[PDB]
Design a protein around this nucleic acid. Structure first.
Ligand SMILES: *CC[C@H](OP(*)(=O)O)[C@H](O)COP(=O)(O)O
Length: 319
DNA sequence: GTCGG
DNA sequence: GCTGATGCGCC
DNA sequence: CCGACGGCGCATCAGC
């Protein structure tokens, strides 16, 4: 219902981010596209859509146009602009943002063919993003994710028994498909006050699960992983993996945050805000009488964060 | 672009 | 060689 | 009428 509208808005969002480099317009168009996608009727007028929050004068007036003519004049102009369309396409490559995209097209590099021809002009990330272009646009069915999980959990257990690995994102909420694999990592040895990630990455490279490294440091890893070929069947497609080392006293605040979604956290952060607590990626802290966030509270589980704000626990399933 | 002080 | 700015991706 | 809208880890480059 109203799919033609939500497409038009997503198409404009991508344009403002990649071509215009107007990030706040991109977020506004997304917000408008998301609300209209949730709406349980067929929008027949821009004035109707305007009642929904995140829809204003301008979007209402291009909804009036789309419903009347069956297309948008501004987008028809952009789709037949060589610069705009090319810049949009290049940014689909991981490591190519709006800056790199613009510079490439300015020196006559527009297509994957042109990127392969000129691999000497790309950094490490962009080369890998090019290598696994199609494999990264593929979704991951929940079946594959469970096999990927067991390997990680097992391999981490082999390195040290005291490691606590939790796979979050769409997967933990019980979604039938996920985009990437976001793993959280902690260890009794590592707190806020008092080579943990290295040896785990080193181990998962040794059993040929992790194939490539996009970035790595003390606390955070981003790379590429692959399930082992059954041999009888065709080899599995390469997936994006993110391993994140978090202090022990900030794990469940980390888990809660990275379990999602964008709306749930915003709603929980908003509810918590007025009840007299400020929660973020790291901690839950009480606000003083003067609206001053003091010392962080202790957290033993996700449940404790719900206990503090007297909000009834919502299992990852229902978020 | 839309919102809210 | 160092330190700070900037690009990129990201609940 | 006009500023806020995401703050951060890592890779890379500009400036010295
Ligand atoms: C489409 C309307 C746009 O609204 P904004 O707050 O960037 C602009 O007015 C540009 O319109 P266009 O020239 O028709 O794209």
């Amino acid at each position: 219902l109203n799919g033609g509208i939500t497409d038009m808005l997503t198409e404009l969002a991508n344009f403002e981010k990649n071509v215009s480099q107007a990030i706040h317009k991109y977020n506004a168009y997304r917000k408008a596209a998301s609300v209209i996608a949730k709406y349980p009727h067929k929008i027949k007028s821009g004035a109707e859509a305007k009642k929904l929050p995140g829809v204003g004068t301008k979007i209402a007036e291009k909804i009036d146009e789309f419903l009347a003519t069956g297309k948008l004049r501004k987008l028809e102009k952009i789709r037949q602009d060589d610069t705009s369309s090319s810049i949009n396409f290049l940014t689909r490559v991981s490591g190519i943002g709006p800056s790199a995209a613009r510079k490439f097209v300015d020196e006559g590099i527009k297509t994957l063919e042109d990127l392969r021809k000129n691999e000497d002009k790309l950094n490490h990330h962009q080369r890998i993003g090019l290598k696994y272009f199609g494999d990264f646009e593929k979704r991951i069915p929940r079946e594959e994710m469970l096999q990927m999980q067991d390997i990680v959990l097992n391999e981490v257990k082999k390195v040290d028994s005291e490691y606590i690995a939790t796979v979050c994102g769409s997967f933990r909420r019980g979604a039938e498909s996920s985009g990437d694999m976001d793993v959280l990592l902690t260890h009794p040895s590592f707190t806020s006050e008092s080579k943990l990630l290295h040896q785990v990455v080193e181990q998962l490279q040794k059993v040929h699960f992790i194939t490539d490294t996009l970035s790595k440091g003390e606390t955070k890893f981003m790379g590429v992983c692959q399930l082992p070929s059954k041999n009888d069947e065709k080899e599995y497609p390469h997936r994006r993996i993110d391993i994140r080392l978090i202090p022990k006293d900030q794990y469940y605040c980390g888990v809660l945050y990275f379990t999602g979604s964008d709306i749930f956290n915003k709603n929980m952060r908003a509810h918590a805000l007025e009840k007299g607590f400020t929660i973020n990626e790291y901690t839950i802290r009480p606000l003083g009488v003067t609206g001053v966030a003091g010392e962080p509270l202790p957290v033993d589980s996700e449940k404790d964060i719900f206990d503090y704000i007297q909000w009834k626990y919502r299992e990852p399933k229902d978020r």
